[PDB]
Design a protein around this ligand. Structure first.
Ligand SMILES: C[C@H]1CCC[C@H](C[C@H]2Cc3cc(O)cc(O)c3C(=O)O2)O1
Ligand SMILES: C[C@H]1CCC[C@H](C[C@H]2Cc3cc(O)cc(O)c3C(=O)O2)O1
Ligand SMILES: N[C@@H](CCCC[NH3+])C(=O)O
Ligand SMILES: N[C@@H](CCCC[NH3+])C(=O)O
Lengths: 500, 502
């Protein structure tokens, strides 16, 4: 607009007039919090002309009460400080009073020097002697996010962070929560590792990958969909307890709970099974909730702050729902065995139509089972609840159930119908594992884009002996959503993927 | 030529069909092997507590026998070895015949044992076992050490073998964890906030590197993997977060060698109201303190040619030498560069200089790439101890603020150690007019064939138009820092799964 062109013209006039133009360094006397923590309990009207302090922040308010007085609010590091600029106090060596202040606009980052104290009304203030424009804002900013549509908050995240305290709070909470989680596992003697995000062969999750290419090696590559296959090789290597926190990359759908890159944690624990992992998940998550909120019952608004509120209860232990048993309890009928037979496939198709459940493609036993548990089970998980004992056909890297035929020692954690955790007793028998890979390879051949190719390097690693192991993954972003009561993953990711 | 793996598959089939233990789901250990040694490592020779039954587990590193009645194992777990003494008179027959139980065990198997704690008469910390369980067999005949491998490339391609046999490799990755924690703590204590910015970018930028290209099908849009987080991190300072850092992977689609892996771990931080003078001071305090933490002093060994070859000492005592970019080139040439540095007269001059001193000519022959080539020849070669090369020309520093005293230069530094780049930092450019102009010049170089030059990023220019406060920013190559702390001359030693050819 004209505001931007005029600002560029102003800065040109300032550069040519020998006046301060983007100064390289401004030495602040102290932070704005610190200034408030030192002078916040002074008597009203107190000043100290024996002390000169330099302060800086972004201008949020300019009010010229008269020709001799200008009131500024600056803001920085979560603290507001008022500046009172009296013409009688102005340092004429920096320019005439009207000139110096004529160059300051709301939104500018600026520095003031002056004397500390509080005003007569009692508001913490600096009684400024000069003003330095450090970095002008070339755009007319709104007062609050109300003056922006609200997808600007996602596409220009600096504007959300500059005007909206609620958003700064979410990302501070995100860091506090990841700190808590690392500590939890560091205390247990885990070793944090990093495994490749560029893979020759992708695997470890049910997802379509991103495809790329390395020009000097002349080979196609994939971004990792999960670190699982590498992490387990470190247990073969004897590291005993490892974890990784980083990005996965999945090339599929974007919605309220899906962003193409998302932060995941995986850990592998030699000699655990999935029963140890349940106890561990409850201890980790209830403790973090308690740490963050001060109690285990926390509000959650699925439709935003003026919509209905749900109170999620994280009190332990959590409800277990057996995968197949609860589907058959919803159906009033038993699935057909073997679970992956054509008869069962047909029966599940028929039940999905009967219960108005969108059919998947292909109509693999695994995808159909997913649809039925999406309908009959994932809908009962308002409080954190474990969905346990997933069928083998949908769990190619999960070890078989020691007692239930066709099942595995797997669990998923759901909160308010949304997946948070996925874990199992790790499959460590190479023969079965190869066969489950081949069934995956054939499903990919039959239209399952989310099916992974065989990874011979992983089979060879299992042939060197994976000790009995429990492994586990957590979608960190979705965890932040519950901890910060957002219902859109875009709220808990700084620069989410936006359509252009 | 190796029936060992076939027979082991056959052995395990027999076991499965005979109803014998076959890959038990859960083996509950009484304690870890390190806890065991802590509890019992000081008992007398010949001590045995037959009132205490314990379950231990580890990988078998050794099987020896004196009779058909007495078998000696060594098991290893969590950095500790414990001897298992299996006497037939103690053998629990409900688990099977003694000879049958132990003929299923091979060196390399993950196995559990149950028995009585104590020490052999010769004084070895031992469990006197009553049973053995095969938890996870090893189908391959293992070497005793990484010396028994066919090639040492096996250590990178099958890193589980390296970790299994070689304490030295295990120590490297513990040192890597320890150093990263130290670094996080240093910045957490300064009030920094850790952030995560996108590794999928619609527009790559923030470094001189060639990107990987990809595609998101639902968005139907081409994407780049990030070469650096710098342009998103600076937006967060515009945002007012004041002090941010990010520790994560960068992806660069270029050459692989001793100091370059296509993905590597970098740290970037941005500090409102710092300049590069502040950043040099912080670099010195952070890096020297970390070095002291690991090594107990500031003078540490390095073997650029291996552990039996020559050993040099790297001196981290502060303050570190400063080399001025253009001056040090000119002292090594014996004459001055032409001004402006980016003029055709100076491009031509610099071509004459690379040919005279037999410096491999860059392509394309941009002023920046020519100047980089001279610096790498005349300046980086002097950086044995940690040293700052400072005040880089603007033509090679599109995101660095102009130098407050030296025309054509910027307020930038790179940290070199043993001639390898460890850090890159500058007073950040926050003036949108010039930033746009240097962006257009980068697109001009990218057009002449400079695969390192980045295209203009309009989202970032618009961010700077909202006011980036004076700021200092900084990047650290963490893999290369570990190379120096751990004394490795190959980046493959400090990355668990490095990129390997076919
Ligand atoms: C690592 C796993 C553990 C299971 C919960 C969670 C699932 C995961 C699925 C997923 C897929 C995808 O394409 C994009 C996403 O943001 C997510 C996510 O947040 O969560 O993460
Ligand atoms: C973030 C930066 C700051 C300067 C040091 C270091 C440079 C970086 C260059 C680089 C390029 C590349 O293609 C592969 C690599 O492993 C590296 C590396 O380790 O170091 O990291
Ligand atoms: N790879 C799994 C997480 C770990 C499952 C247990 N090994 C996922 O992406 O969902
Ligand atoms: N982006 C730089 C590091 C930060 C430079 C200061 N902004 C690099 O990758 O080398």
């Amino acid at each position: 607009s004209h505001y931007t062109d005029n600002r560029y013209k102003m800065m040109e006039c300032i550069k040519d007039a020998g006046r301060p133009f983007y100064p390289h360094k401004f030495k602040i006397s102290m932070s704005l919090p610190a200034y408030a923590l030192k002078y916040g309990n002074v008597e009203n009207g107190y000043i100290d002309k024996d002390t000169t302090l330099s302060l800086s922040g972004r201008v949020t308010s300019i009010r010229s009460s008269s020709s001799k007085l200008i009131f500024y609010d600056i803001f920085c590091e979560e603290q507001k400080v008022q500046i009172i600029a009296n013409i009688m106090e102005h340092d004429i060596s920096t320019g005439e009073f009207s000139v110096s202040h004529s160059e300051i606009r709301r939104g500018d980052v600026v520095g003031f020097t002056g004397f500390p104290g509080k005003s007569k009304r009692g508001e913490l203030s600096l009684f400024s002697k000069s003003v330095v424009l450090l970095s002008p804002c070339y755009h007319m900013l709104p007062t609050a996010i109300s003056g922006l549509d609200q997808e600007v908050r996602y596409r220009q995240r600096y504007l959300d962070l500059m005007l909206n305290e609620e958003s700064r709070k979410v990302f501070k909470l995100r860091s506090r929560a990841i700190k808590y989680i690392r500590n939890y596992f560091d205390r247990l003697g885990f070793l944090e590792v990093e495994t490749p995000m560029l893979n020759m062969i992708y695997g470890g999750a049910a997802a379509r990958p991103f495809i790329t290419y390395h020009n000097e090696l002349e080979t196609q590559l994939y971004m990792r969909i999960a670190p699982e296959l590498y992490l387990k090789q470190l247990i073969v290597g004897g590291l005993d307890k490892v974890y990784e926190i980083g990005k996965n990359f999945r090339n599929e759908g974007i919605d309220l709970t899906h962003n193409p890159e998302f932060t995941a944690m995986e850990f592998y624990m030699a000699y655990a099974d999935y029963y140890d992992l349940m106890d561990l998940t409850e201890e980790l998550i209830s403790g973090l909730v308690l740490e963050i909120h001060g109690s285990l019952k926390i509000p959650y608004h699925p439709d935003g702050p003026e919509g209905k509120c749900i109170e999620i209860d994280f009190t332990t232990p959590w409800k277990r729902f057996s995968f197949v048993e609860e589907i058959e309890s919803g159906l009033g009928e038993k699935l057909k065995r073997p679970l992956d037979s054509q008869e069962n496939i047909d029966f599940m198709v028929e039940m999905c139509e009967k219960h108005e459940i969108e059919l998947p493609h292909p109509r693999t036993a695994a995808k159909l089972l997913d649809k039925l548990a999406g309908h009959f089970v994932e809908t009962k998980c308002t409080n954190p609840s474990f969905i346990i004992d997933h069928p083998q056909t949908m769990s190619p890297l999960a070890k078989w159930h020691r007692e239930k035929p066709e099942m595995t020692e797997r669990f998923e954690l759901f909160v308010l119908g949304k997946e948070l955790c996925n874990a199992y007793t790790e499959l460590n028998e190479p023969l079965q594992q190869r066969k489950f890979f081949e069934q995956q390879a054939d499903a990919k051949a039959s239209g399952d884009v989310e099916a992974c190719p065989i990874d011979e390097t992983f089979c060879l690693a299992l042939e060197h002996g994976l000790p009995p192991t429990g492994g586990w993954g957590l979608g960190i972003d979705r965890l932040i959503m519950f901890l910060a009561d957002k219902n859109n993953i875009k709220e808990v990711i700084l620069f989410p993927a936006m359509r252009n």
